[PDB]
Amino acid sequence: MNIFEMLRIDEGLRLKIYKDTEGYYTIGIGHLLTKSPSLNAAKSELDKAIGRNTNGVITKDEAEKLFNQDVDAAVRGILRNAKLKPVYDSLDAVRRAALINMVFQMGETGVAGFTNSLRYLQQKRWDEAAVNLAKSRWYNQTPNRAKRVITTFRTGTWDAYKNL
């Protein structure tokens, strides 16, 4: 298991434009195109992203390319954030992957706001961190996925992704 396999499990793979859990146009392995209700708009972002006139469908390779870029961007976002960096630097590899996971899903800024959870994680108070993480809109809207991520932060193991 690794961050790529983990997020591939959590985001799935679709080669045609579709709507994510929040109703937003996305494609590939969780690549958000736009929050706009305009499909044309989404298509325009997709074409710009891929570099060709696609008509809303991409290949697996293309999808993987954006995914690699998105994972890298999540990492970069953590490293550049004053609140996330220290947390990430203080964690082991498995837990670091959990944090990357949340940032890919919600963006640097959104995760940076989980002040209290961040502090518990920095303190290595696993169970407390897990409880706190669950008190969120994130957990309520995507509970199965959140449970997986939280279990990963709680145990420092990939047990939640095992068998998937």
Q: Would you say 53 is a known binding-site residue?
A: no
Which tokens belong to 75? Answer: 């990492």
Instruction: Considering only residues 30 through 89, tell me which ones interact with K ion, judged by CB under 5 A.
Output: 30
31-32 and 14-19 beta bridge pairing: unpaired
Give the residue with the Cβ less far from K ion, 81 or 142.
142
Separation of alpha carbons 163 and 21, rounded Å: 23
Q: Would you say 104 is a known binding-site residue?
A: yes
Residue of 10, 20, 62, 108 with catalytic role: 20
Confirm or reject binding of residue 49 to Cl ion (CB under 5 A).
yes
Q: Would you say 101 is a known binding-site residue?
A: no
Q: Which does 70 bind (CB under 5 to 8 A by kind): Cl ion, K ion, none?
A: none
* In contact, 53 and 43? CB cutoff 8 Å: no
Size of the site for Cl ion (CB under 5 A): 4
Residue 63 to residues 6, 30, 100, 108, 132, Cα–Cα distance (Å): 16, 9, 19, 22, 34
Separation of alpha carbons 85 and 106, rounded Å: 16
Q: Which does 145 bind (CB under 5 to 8 A by kind): Cl ion, K ion, none?
A: Cl ion
Which residues of the chain form contacts with Cl ion (CB under 5 A)? 49, 142, 144-145
Which residues of the chain form contacts with K ion (CB under 5 A)? 11, 30
Annotated binding site: 32, 104, 117, 132
